[PDB]
RNA sequence: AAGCUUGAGUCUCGUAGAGGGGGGUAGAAUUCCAGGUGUAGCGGUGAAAUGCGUAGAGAUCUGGAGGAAUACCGGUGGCGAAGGCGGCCCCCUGGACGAAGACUGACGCUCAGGUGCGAAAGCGUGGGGAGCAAACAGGAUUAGAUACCCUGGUAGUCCACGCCGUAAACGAUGUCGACUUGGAGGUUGUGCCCUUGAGGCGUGGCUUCCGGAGCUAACGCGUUAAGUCGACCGCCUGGGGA
RNA sequence: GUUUAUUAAAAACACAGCACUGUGCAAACACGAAAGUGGACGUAUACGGUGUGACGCCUGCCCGGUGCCGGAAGGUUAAU
C-alpha cells in the first residue's frame, strides 16, 4: 500500500511512502552480507567520474542469487524483508539440508511454500524450468537469456517480461522498455511477476529526503561559471546555443548505441 | 436460492410443533439465513447491484417482521434475537 | 435442439457462398432458422464446423 | 392499495346503471348490507341477496320500471380523510327535496328524515335522488 | 454428484506421452470421491478447418460424475500442458458406461 | 386488549429470459513487419486536387505481429430498477411465473431528508492505439472558406480501476388497488380426453398493433386507459429579462 | 534550507514535483597519456545529458536557417 502524511508542520503533507503490513524484519544473514562502501564519484585515478553525489547515510549490500545451481533439491521461503539495494524486496530461502540464500521476491508476499528447479517443475511461483515447456502468451519473470550472466531482466519493483511467440529451438520476449528480443527456448525461467510494484508512486515531499541517500543538489550549466560548464552563467535567461554535455558535445536526439554484437537478437527496437 | 435441505436445519430449530413455517419467528430465521448467505456471496466480487438490491429487499422484509414480532410479543422477540445476530 | 453435431446433415442447410439456406427454401418454421443458427454456433465452438469461408 | 370498502361501492352502481345492467355485485361488509337495507326500504332498489363461503358477495337489483332508470342521482358525500358532519337542522335536503341522504348516527344507519325525526345529527354516508 | 463428459484433444504427434497426464487427471476425480464411467478413446479424427497449423486431434473422454466444487480447479489442469489441449467439459446430460 | 382471514407473505414439484458479476473463448480486414512475382499506375469527387508511387506502389502471395468488437439467427421477440443488455462454454446470483396444497394472521399502500445506481462526453494514475475522428495542417472551392466536400491526423473511443452524477434518461403519462366491449398476434408455464394425439377442449404470467363506451382544446389515452374512483408523495401560476 | 573571513544577503540559488533526450546492460557516459575504477555488484518501477520549480487549475502556430532522426534510390564527391 501507499500512505500520505498529515500536515503536522510545513510541507510534510506531500510525503507518500510504500507500506506493507506483512513485510518482515530482522537481522541480515552475515555470509550473504557485505558493507560494500561508498563510491562518492571521487576517483582513484584522478578527477571525478560522476556528478550529483556526496554524503548519504550508511548502507550495506545483501547478496542475491541469479545462478540457481542447486537442482532437484526442495527449498522453503522463510521470510520476506525490506531490501536497501533493490526496490523489488528480497526473500530468505532455506534448503532441505541447511543452506540459506537470498532470492528475488516472487509474488504473494508469503513464506512457507517449497520450490524446486529442473527440466520440469511445478506451476507455482519460485519454481524454475525452460521456456520450451510453455505454450507462450504469459509472464516469464527473470530469464537466463545468456547462461554465462545468470538470470537477466526484470529485477526492480513490479517489473515483468512477456513471452510472445515460438518456433522450434527459439522464443521471443517483449520488455517494458520498448525493446523485443529472441532467445533459445531451453533458457531457464521462473514464471510469473515481481512483487512490490508501488515504488514509482513514492513522493519525497522534502528537500532533505534525497540528501540522506547521498544525492547532491543539481546546479544548471547556464548558471555556473562560463569555464566550469560549456553553457556558462548569464546573460540572464538566455541559454544562447544548442544544448551540450559538460564535455562540450551535442547529445539531444543523437543515438549512441555502437555495440553491433547483440542487434541480431533484437527483433523490435526501442524508439 | 436456498435448498429444502438447508431449510431442514432452520425449521427444525426455530419451529415448535410443525408445521410452524408460516410464523414470524421462522420467517425471520429463513430471511436471516438468506441475508447472511447473500452477504457473502460478496467479497470476492462487489459490482452487482441486482443481488445487492435483493439483499436489501430481504433486509427490508426482516426489519419489518422483527418490528412486527416486537409489536405482538416482546418476550418472543427477545428470545429470537439471541439466536440470530442483532445489535451485537 | 437435435442431432446438431452431424455435419453430413448440417451441410444440407449451408451454402457454397459461405452463407445459410433460407427457411423459405427448406420449407421450415422461423424457429428452425434459429435452431439452425444455434446448431452452426454450437458446431463452430466444438471444432465440427468452420467459422468462415473464402478460398 | 385498498383503504375504504365504500370507495368501490357506488362506482359499480353508477357505471352498471350506465351499462344498462339489471343487477350489480360487490364484496360484502356490515355497512354495505346496512346501506342496502335502507335503500330497499326507501324503494331505491328492488331486492338484495348475499352469499359466499370463501368470500361473501352481495348482489342488488336495479329499478328501470319500463325502461328509464328510477334512481336519478347516486352520490357519496363525505370520505374518511375529510368527513362531513351535520347537526339536527343542518341535515341536507338532497336535490332540493327531490332526493334523500343517509347518515350513520349513534343509533345506526338511517335516513336524514329518521335523524331529523329523532332530533339528532351525525356523519353523512350517501346522497341519492 | 454432477455429470461432466470431459473430452480431450490430445496432440496427433505427441499421444506417446498421454498416459502420464491421464494418471494425474483420474487422481483428481478419485480423490474427490467421483465415479468414472468409461475413460475411452474415439481415436484420431479430422478437424473442420486447420487451427494452430493442425488439422487432426486424438479424442479421449472420461464421464466423471464429480462434485460440482472441483470444476474451477480442474478446467485449468489441461490449459497450459500444450500436449493435451482444447478440452471441453460438457456439463450434465448424464453418462454412458463402459462404451467407446 | 381479546379473536380471525378468503388483505399481504413464503414454499414442496417445476418455467423462460441479449439482466448482472467472475472466468474465459473464437474469427476477419484497413494496419504494421521481412521479402518475392511485377510495371506505372494508385487514391478520390457533383466536378478536381493535395496526397500515395519507380526508394518498385496499387494489387497478389509466404511467414508473423497489433487492437477492437462479437456478423448469421434477430422477429411477430425477451431481460433489467432505470441507464442499458445478444456469441459459445464453465461457475456465482437478484427478481418474476405455473401446477396441486399449506403455515402465519393486517405483518399492508405511500414517503420529506436519506441510502445506492450512469448513457455519451469530461477529470485522475499507468498502459493502449487497426478503424472512426474533434483540434490541426493541407487540397481546395469561393467574392472570402477560417466550414460543407476530398488527403493526412492527435485528443477521445479500449483496459486496470478511481471519480463525475447528468440526457429528447421519451409511449415527454409519479407510486399503489379495484371495476369493466373486443379483434389480430407474439412469448412462457400448465389443467384434461387410452393426450393411445399429430389433434381437440381449456387456463395463469408477460406483451405488440388496430380500436369501442368514457376522457381530452386537439392530437392521443383507450381494461397494460390520459377511463371509473380512492390513499400518499413530488410540483405549479405569462414570455423578453433569467 | 544555500549565498563570498573585515562596505554589496535578497526577489538570486537549491528543494517536493514537471518535460524532453541518450541507455538492453560487458548500458550509455566519465576520469585515468593507463594499469584500473566510477557508472552499479543498481538492470527499464534502473542509470547518463539539459531545462522547469511545492501545491490547485494549465500548455497556439513555424522544420526556411543551425542541430538531430527515418530513407538510402538519386545528385554532389575525396584519398584511391
From Swiss-Prot, chain A:
Residues 27-52, 220-271 are annotated as: Disordered. PROSITE patterns: RIBOSOMAL_L2. GO terms for molecular function: RNA binding; rRNA binding; structural constituent of ribosome; transferase activity; zinc ion binding. Keywords: Acetylation, Ribonucleoprotein, Ribosomal protein, RNA-binding, rRNA-binding. Transmembrane segments: none annotated. It comes from the Bacteria. Residues 38-47 have a biased composition (Low complexity). One of its GO terms (biological process) is ribosomal large subunit assembly. GO terms for cellular component: cytoplasm; cytosol; cytosolic large ribosomal subunit; DnaA-L2 complex. The modification N6-acetyllysine is found at residue 241. The keyword Nucleus does not apply. Part of the 50S ribosomal subunit. Forms a bridge to the 30S subunit in the 70S ribosome, contacting the 16S rRNA. Interacts weakly with S6 in one of the 3.5 A resolved structures. In pull-down experiments interacts with CedA. Belongs to the universal ribosomal protein uL2 family. HAMAP family: Ribosomal_uL2_B (MF_01320_B). This protein can be partially replaced in vivo by its H.marismortui (HmaL2) or human (L8, from the 60S cytoplasmic ribosome) homolog. NCBIfam families: rplB_bact (TIGR01171). This is Large ribosomal subunit protein uL2. The lineage of its organism: Bacteria, Pseudomonadati, Pseudomonadota, Gammaproteobacteria, Enterobacterales.
From Swiss-Prot, chain B:
The keyword Cell membrane does not apply. Gene3D superfamilies: 6.10.250.3130, S15/NS1, RNA-binding. InterPro entries: Ribosomal_uS15 (IPR000589), Ribosomal_uS15_bac-type (IPR005290), uS15_NS1_RNA-bd_sf (IPR009068). Keywords: Ribonucleoprotein, Ribosomal protein, RNA-binding, rRNA-binding, Translation regulation. Induction: Part of the metY operon that extends to pnp, also has its own promoter. The keyword Ribonucleoprotein applies. Pfam families: Ribosomal_S15. GO terms for cellular component: cytoplasm; cytosol; cytosolic small ribosomal subunit. GO terms for molecular function: rRNA binding; small ribosomal subunit rRNA binding; structural constituent of ribosome. GO terms for biological process: cytoplasmic translation; regulation of translation; ribosomal small subunit assembly; translation. Belongs to the universal ribosomal protein uS15 family. NCBIfam families: S15_bact. Part of the 30S ribosomal subunit. Forms a bridge to the 50S subunit in the 70S ribosome, contacting the 23S rRNA. This is Small ribosomal subunit protein uS15. The gene is rpsO.
Swiss-Prot record, chain D:
Pfam families: Ribosomal_S8. Keywords: Repressor, Ribonucleoprotein, Ribosomal protein, RNA-binding, rRNA-binding, Translation regulation. Gene3D superfamilies: 3.30.1370.30, 3.30.1490.10. InterPro entries: Ribosomal_uS8 (IPR000630), Ribosomal_uS8_CS (IPR047863), Ribosomal_uS8_sf (IPR035987). It comes from the Bacteria. The keyword Repressor applies. The keyword Repressor applies. GO terms for biological process: cytoplasmic translation; regulation of mRNA stability; regulation of translation; ribosomal small subunit assembly. Transmembrane segments: none annotated. GO terms for cellular component: cytoplasm; cytosol; cytosolic small ribosomal subunit. GO terms for molecular function: rRNA binding; structural constituent of ribosome. One of the primary rRNA binding proteins, it binds directly to 16S rRNA central domain where it helps coordinate assembly of the platform of the 30S subunit. Part of the 30S ribosomal subunit. Contacts proteins S5 and S12. Belongs to the universal ribosomal protein uS8 family. This is Small ribosomal subunit protein uS8.
UniProtKB/Swiss-Prot annotation, chain E:
Coiled coil: none annotated. One of its GO terms (biological process) is cytoplasmic translation. GO terms for molecular function: mRNA 5'-UTR binding; small ribosomal subunit rRNA binding; structural constituent of ribosome. 5 different forms of the protein, varying only in the number of C-terminal glutamate residues, were isolated. The sequence shown is form bS6-6, which is the longest. The first two Glu are encoded by the rpsF gene, the other Glu are added post-translationally by the RimK enzyme. The modification N6-acetyllysine is found at residue 93. Disulfide bonds: none annotated. One of its GO terms (cellular component) is cytosolic small ribosomal subunit. Belongs to the bacterial ribosomal protein bS6 family. Binds together with bS18 to 16S ribosomal RNA. Part of the 30S ribosomal subunit. Interacts weakly with uL2 in one of the 3.5 A resolved structures. This is Small ribosomal subunit protein bS6. The gene is rpsF.
